[PDB]
Amino acid sequence: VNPGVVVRISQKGLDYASQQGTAALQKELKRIKIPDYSDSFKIKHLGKGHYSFYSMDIREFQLPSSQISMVPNVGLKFSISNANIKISGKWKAQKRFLKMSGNFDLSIEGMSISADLKLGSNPTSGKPTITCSSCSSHINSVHVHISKSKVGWLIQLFHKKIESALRNKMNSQVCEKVTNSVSSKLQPYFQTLPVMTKIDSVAGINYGLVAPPATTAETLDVQMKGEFYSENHHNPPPFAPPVMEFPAAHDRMVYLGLSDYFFNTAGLVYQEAGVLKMTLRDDMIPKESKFRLTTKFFGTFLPEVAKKFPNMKIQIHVSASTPPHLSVQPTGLTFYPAVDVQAFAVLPNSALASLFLIGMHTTGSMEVSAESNRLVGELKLDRLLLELKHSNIGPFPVELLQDIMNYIVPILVLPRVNEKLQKGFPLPTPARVQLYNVVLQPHQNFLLFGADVVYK
Numbered sequence: 001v002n003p004g005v006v007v008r009i010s011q012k013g014l015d016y017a018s019q020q021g022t023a024a025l026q027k028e029l030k031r032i033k034i035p036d037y038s039d040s041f042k043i044k045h046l047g048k049g050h051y052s053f054y055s056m057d058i059r060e061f062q063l064p065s066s067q068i069s070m071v072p073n074v075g076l077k078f079s080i081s082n083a084n085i086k087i088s089g090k091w092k093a094q095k096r097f098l099k100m101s102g103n104f105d106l107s108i109e110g111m112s113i114s115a116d117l118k119l120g121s122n123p124t125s126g127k128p129t130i131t132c133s134s135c136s137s138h139i140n141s142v143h144v145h146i147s148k149s150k151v152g153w154l155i156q157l158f159h160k161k162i163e164s165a166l167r168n169k170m171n172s173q174v175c176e177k178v179t180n181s182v183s184s185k186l187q188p189y190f191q192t193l194p195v196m197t198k199i200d201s202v203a204g205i206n207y208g209l210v211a212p213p214a215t216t217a218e219t220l221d222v223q224m225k226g227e228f229y230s231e232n233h234h235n236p237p238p239f240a241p242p243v244m245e246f247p248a249a250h251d252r253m254v255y256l257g258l259s260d261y262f263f264n265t266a267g268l269v270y271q272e273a274g275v276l277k278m279t280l281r282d283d284m285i286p287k288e289s290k291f292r293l294t295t296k297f298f299g300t301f302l303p304e305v306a307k308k309f310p311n312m313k314i315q316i317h318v319s320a321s322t323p324p325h326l327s328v329q330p331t332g333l334t335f336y337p338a339v340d341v342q343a344f345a346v347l348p349n350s351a352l353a354s355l356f357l358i359g360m361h362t363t364g365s366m367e368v369s370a371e372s373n374r375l376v377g378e379l380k381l382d383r384l385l386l387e388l389k390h391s392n393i394g395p396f397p398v399e400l401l402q403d404i405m406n407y408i409v410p411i412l413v414l415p416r417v418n419e420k421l422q423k424g425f426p427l428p429t430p431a432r433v434q435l436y437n438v439v440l441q442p443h444q445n446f447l448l449f450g451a452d453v454v455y456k
């Protein structure tokens with residue numbers, strides 16, 4: 001099925017992911033435990049004894065450079081190159097009754113760590129997966145700076161008996177940490193991505209992955225369902241999502257393709273739940289106005305109203321007749337709302353007497369922006385078109401209600417609607433990230449959302 005939303009992370013985005021990762025990887029690397037090395041010796045002109053290098057602690061583990069390359073159709077390749085591991089510890093040697101002790105410094109440089117990241121999807125939950133398929137460290141030199149006392153044999157000893165085991169265990173510990181951090185911390189983090197985002201008492205958005213993440217030459221492509229759903233009653237959309245093929249760029253870190261299907265499912269869900277309705281009472285209009293929802297006022301042009309229903313208030317019911325459409329094109333987004341406006345006369349017992357039913361429809365601009373990690377918008381209308389559907393007070397020129405419709409609608413109706421639109425809809429962002437410096441480029445059948453991300 002064509003996805004309703006597509007997320008494309010660019011190289012700039014991956015570079016950021018790697019910098020945050022490496023930084024987080026440094027801490028785990030600095031917590032590696034290297035054993036104590038105690039062994040005996042017997043040198044031709046020195047004698048027999050027991051040496052010991054122990055109580056070693058990692059003081060600095062700098063990872064200056066890190067990089068994530070994209071291996072088309074395969075995955076990511078994480079690489080660190082000039083790793084510097086500065087270790088410190090103590091040592092003690094004993095020759096007969098001679099006891100010698102002191103601290104020592106060790107420096108491991110030119111360490112290279114390479115790891116393969118494989119991306120997948122979990123169908124039963126719709127969450128992305130990431131695991132480390134391969135890892136390999138590599139140490140170039142080991143500078144044992146016990147340069148403080150004339151004890152060359154001990155330094156010779158370190159290189160001839162200990163170095164070969166230290167490096168091997170260091171290379172294993174590093175890849176052990178990397179592999180673990182991926183499964184235990186990288187994967188669980190990217191699963192904070194919203195799958196079933198509940199936005200209110202009525203709707204929610206389904207951001208579930210509909211296929212495994214595809215790695216290309218220059219982008220990591222993520223396909224999401226992107227359809228507003230209802231929990232009170234499930235109903236599939238009478239349309240299919242468009243193929244969102246957009247220019248892969250590297251100006252921003254991430255790019256979202258928000259299809260028209262996505263936006264239109266919202267309209268369907270809110271309509272069918274019977275919530276796009278509103279009651280206008282005469283007391284909502286500020287007391288200092290020309291128009292009044294009273295039969296008296298309506299008497300100026302429709303009496304009838306004042307003739308059958310003498311001096312009473314008027315109540316108007318505004319409801320959506322059909323699901324509001326939203327068209328996305330390179331010029332901008334257009335909204336097509338159709339409403340049923342029915343006027344009732346409020347009898348002295350609070351009962352409602354149907355006056356007439358009006359069919360209104362218009363065309364407006366839907367502007368879209370982003371605040372925090374939300375998608376907000378604002379609706380603006382054009383001329384309103386009235387149509388008379390049925391009248392209990394006889395046929396009349398439906399054009400007489402134009403002035404009333406042109407006050408009520410933009411003063412009473414539009415305001416409430418824009419409040420929800422300005423509240424917005426949650427975007428598919430993982431935890432602890434905020435989107436800044438965004439660009440919204442309208443395209444044919446979908447909206448392009450580009451942005452930079454900042455990880456807390």
Ligand SMILES: CCCCCCCCCCCCCCCCCC(=O)OC[C@H](COP(=O)([O-])OCC[N+](C)(C)C)OC(=O)CCCCCCCCCCCCCCCCC
Nearest residue numbers: 007013017018020021024025078181182185186254428429
């Ligand atoms: C696709 C979603 C659309 C929404 C827009 C956001 C899209 C994401 C684009 C990247 C920008 C966001 C950066 C996220 C940072 C990644 C995790 C992090 O910083 O620390 C993890 C966490 C870091 O730990 P921690 O700091 O988060 O919390 C742990 C704290 N301690 C350690 C004390 C317990 O776990 C790790 O292991 C860090 C990375 C180690 C291995 C390095 C691997 C290379 C880097 C990974 C980048 C590849 C990701 C590919 C994404 C594709 C999947 C959709």
